[PDB]
């Protein structure tokens, strides 16, 4: 019984918050666990809101490819493109930025709370270049907030605006929005863990800012539902959001690493991960949309990490 297996599986790891599996299109699993405010007495729920965080990569990825399709950009247009101040990495192609195959870096963004403009100049001026990392798979966000300041120059309207309307809107999703305006109804919160803390205690919460939370643009300042979260990965492997072909394109590993258009490439179908703010997010998804596990937690851990759990259901859901 796949119930039994997967909650045991989520008891052992002290897994605190939703978990969903699907197979074939067809939820097989969809449950809670632990709290979502202990202080007020709420439980985490199937519905209940939590951070995407980096998975949302995926997402500003696909707007840059539906510019793609559009015919307004192409991959190979080099980061000065868009960006004329840059003085290093001006060669930078979209197709890097896409694969985290550059050499930029944002040490930190602003102390204060900008509007989306001034986050996007904050990084365009204090971006730092290496050379060595170029054409090298290696993990920065300052890829995809540049990628976001693409969408806003090419469109002439904000990224959330562009988000709103592309999934939000697009799919109607109930339980997706920017954690800047609030999460509302079935809102959950972060909590602070220490290295080795393995049991949920709920004794620290997390803080984050509203700084924090704008300088997250077009990298993790998302919350959705599991139920969501599953809709637009769903959504984008099976054509609905830019064609199949596209999809293919910009989902292309490199030779340095399986990420590949803001999504780990595998065998046996995608992976995205986010860590930040007290949560963690994880998504396995088979290459046809239809199979995959949803995790996510509020209530990060390193010690017990839910990613290692998601992948550990995903490969056994994926033999059948």
């Given at each position: 019984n796949t119930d039994e297996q997967v909650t045991k599986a989520l008891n052992l790891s002290h897994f605190v918050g939703s978990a969903l599996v699907v197979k074939n299109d067809h939820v097989i699993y969809n449950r809670a666990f632990g709290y979502a405010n202990k202080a007020k007495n709420q439980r985490n729920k199937v519905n209940s809101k939590y951070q995407i965080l980096s998975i949302q990569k995926s997402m500003t990825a696909v707007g840059i490819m539906q510019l793609v399709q559009a015919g307004k950009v192409k991959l190979t247009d080099p980061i000065s493109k868009y960006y004329p101040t840059l003085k290093h990495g001006r060669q930078t192609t979209l197709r890097q930025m896409l694969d985290m195959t550059t050499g930029f870096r944002l040490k930190s963004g602003s102390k204060e709370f900008l509007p989306e403009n001034q986050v996007i100049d904050f990084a365009a001026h204090n971006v730092f270049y290496y050379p060595d990392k170029n054409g090298i798979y290696n993990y920065s966000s300052v890829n995809f907030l540049l990628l976001a300041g693409i969408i806003r120059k090419v469109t002439g309207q904000s990224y959330q605006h562009f988000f709103t309307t592309h999934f939000i809107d697009k799919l109607n999703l109930n339980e997706t929005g920017f954690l800047i305006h609030?999460?509302?109804?079935?809102?959950?919160?972060?909590?602070?863990?220490?290295?080795?803390?393995?049991?949920?205690?709920?004794?620290?919460?997390m803080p984050e800012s509203k700084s924090q939370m704008a300088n997250e643009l077009g990298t993790g300042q998302v919350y959705m539902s599991t139920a969501d979260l599953f809709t637009v990965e769903s959504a984008i492997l099976k054509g609905q959001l830019l064609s199949k072909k596209n999809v293919a394109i910009l989902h292309t590993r490199t030779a340095t690493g399986e990420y590949g258009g803001g999504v780990y490439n595998m065998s046996n179908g995608i992976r995205s991960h986010g860590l930040g703010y007290g949560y963690e997010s994880s998504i396995f998804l088979s290459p046809d949309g239809k199979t995959g596990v949803v995790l996510m937690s509020n209530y990060y851990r390193k010690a017990a990490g839910i990613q290692a759990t998601a992948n550990k259901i995903f490969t056994e859901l994926m033999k059948g």
């Open positions: 609030g999460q509302g109804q079935d809102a959950t919160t972060g909590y602070r863990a220490l290295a080795d803390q393995t049991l949920p205690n709920y004794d620290q919460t």
